[PDB]
């Protein structure tokens, strides 16, 4: 599926969760699927670096993530300043049929 | 006017009508974004009321039907098990599986109403 060839967000984002060196800008939160957002504007700044989009900020990146909701890719941790979580149980139905 | 003057001519001339004169591939168009279980209940509950939304898949032509002037000859669920048996473009004209929500139908020129309607002029 075209997640392999062309770079996504959730694909790109998790380059940084699993990588211990980039814990400066993000980290997993607990056993269950959850993640923090350390430097919200730096997070974006690198997403801009990759997307060749220097203008990029959080507000821009963020929206794209708020699409994911309706698609069942990830969801929000309600109230928590910059904390969402992945719907893997869905990613596979979204990467394979049933 | 409600109908065209040459009511019989149009049905037996127009490409549109003769394409739907033969028994063609039809399917239920109602509630496309709903699960297979719900669609089966809605379609059947509608047929009994005397209405539905069927389209000729081959051509694309969609329709909303009314089986009326409850009814006997218009909607019949007894003819076979697991299935059931207007003025189009100014021309008076007249089965689906209860599990698959697909089957076969067609148009037929209404000689009865084409005289009744043309008389109103």
């Amino acid at each position: 599926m075209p997640g392999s060839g062309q770079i996504q967000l959730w694909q790109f984002l998790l380059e940084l969760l699993s990588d211990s060196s980039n814990s400066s800008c993000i980290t997993w939160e607990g056993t269950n699927g959850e993640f923090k957002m350390t430097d919200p504007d730096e997070v974006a700044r690198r997403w801009g670096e990759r997307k060749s989009k220097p203008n990029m900020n959080y507000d821009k990146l963020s929206r794209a993530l708020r699409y994911y909701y309706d698609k069942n890719i990830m969801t929000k941790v309600h109230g928590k300043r910059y904390a969402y979580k992945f719907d893997f149980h869905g990613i596979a139905q979204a990467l394979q049929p049933h | 006017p409600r109908v065209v003057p040459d009511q019989r001519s149009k049905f037996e001339n127009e490409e549109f009508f003769r394409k739907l004169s033969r028994e063609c591939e039809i399917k239920y168009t109602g509630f496309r974004d709903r699960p297979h279980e719900e669609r089966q209940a809605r379609f059947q509950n509608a047929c009994r009321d005397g209405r539905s939304e069927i389209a000729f898949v081959a051509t694309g032509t969609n329709l909303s039907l009314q089986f009326f002037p409850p009814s006997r000859e218009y909607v019949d669920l007894e003819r076979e098990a697991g299935k059931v048996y207007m003025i189009l473009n100014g021309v008076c004209v007249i089965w689906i599986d209860l599990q698959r929500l697909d089957g076969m139908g067609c148009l037929e020129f209404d000689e009865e109403r084409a005289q009744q309607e043309d008389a109103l002029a």
Binding site: - | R2, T29, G60, L63, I87
Partner: protein, 117 residues
Amino acid sequence: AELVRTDSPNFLCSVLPSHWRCNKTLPVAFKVVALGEVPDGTVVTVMAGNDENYSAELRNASAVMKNQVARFNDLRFVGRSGRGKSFTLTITVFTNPPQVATYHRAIKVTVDGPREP
């Protein structure tokens, strides 16, 4: 507004543009005209017909006849027609009995409204 022919010469509708984006506020809201006297209150629904996805998803698809003219607040085309292909959309008029006017080569529904390529 500007009108166009139908397959029923008893009813006429808006000039829905050539090619438009998947679910967009239409550039000119949909006007359906009744030349034969229709009771101002009768409902008028539409169904997008095409060999591909025979019944596409539509929004604000139902409207109310008023002063012999049914206006669709803002109809929107969700289900795409495909490459080159366009909808032969069906136009119902809930009466006893109902009447329809088919409309071939109505509009081309893609994910892009035609850009400068």
